[PDB]
Amino acid sequence: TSSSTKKTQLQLEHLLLDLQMILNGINNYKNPKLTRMLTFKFYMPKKATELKHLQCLEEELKKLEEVLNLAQSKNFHLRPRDLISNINVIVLELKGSETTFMCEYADETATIVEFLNRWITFSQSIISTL
């Protein structure tokens, strides 16, 4: 692979790992607020096959932050503000130069777990196809 491909694969892995960390940290037998967190409704991408589709993740990060404020502080090195800001920086760069592309959402909302599963899968998939 090229150097550009490799650094994109690296940004995507860093994105992956932070999304993974959030999901593991909230979705476990020990989190007494998981039930409450699952009541929130995340918008989902209609299609997520290309880096520009990360726009759909970006637009949900404020919501993600709000839900993460219910999590166990002890499960995260960073405060949710700082973790989400890091994800935001990576997403902004990975999605590419913003055209007239606002992203297209599915009608069905999803729990935080479904939402994070979608984006982790998306990231794993794109790494594999670069």
Author numbering: 23 to 152
From the article:
IL-2 functions as a lymphocyte growth and stimulatory factor, signaling via activation of the heterodimeric IL-2 receptor complex consisting of two subunits, IL-2 receptor β (CD122) and the common γ receptor subunit (CD132), or the heterotrimeric IL-2 receptor complex that includes IL-2 Rα (CD25). IL-2 activation of the IL-2 Rβγ complex induces proliferative and activation signals through STAT5 phosphorylation that drive effector T and natural killer (NK) cell expansion and tumor clearance. Structures of the IL-2/heterotrimeric receptor signaling complex demonstrated that the IL-2 Rα and βγ subunits engage IL-2 from opposite sides and that the α subunit engages IL-2 independently of the IL-2R βγ interfaces.
The proline residue at position 65 in human IL-2 appears to impart a significant bend in helix H3, a region that mediates substantial interactions with IL-2 Rα14,15. As the sequence of THOR-707 contains a substitution of this proline to a lysine-like residue, we reasoned that this modification might result in a distinct helical conformation that mis-aligns residues critical for IL-2 Rα engagement. The lysine residue incorporated at position 65 was selected to mimic the effect of the AzK substitution of this position on protein structure, as lysine constitutes the majority of the backbone of the AzK residue without the excessive hydrophobicity of the un-conjugated azide. Structural alignments show that the lysine substitution for proline at position 65 did not result in large-scale changes to the IL-2 tertiary structure, including the conformation of helix H3. Consistent with the above biochemical and ex vivo data, an inspection of the P65K region in the structure shows that this modification occupies a region of the IL-2/IL-2 Rα interface that mediates productive interactions. The similar stepwise and minor reductions in potency of PEG size variants in both CD8+ T cells and Tregs suggest that PEG polymers are not specifically required to prevent IL-2 Rα engagement, but may impact potency in THOR-707 via non-specific envelopment as observed with other pegylated cytokines. Together, these results suggest that steric effects mediated largely by the substitution of proline 65 with AzK result in the reduction in IL-2 Rα engagement by THOR-707.
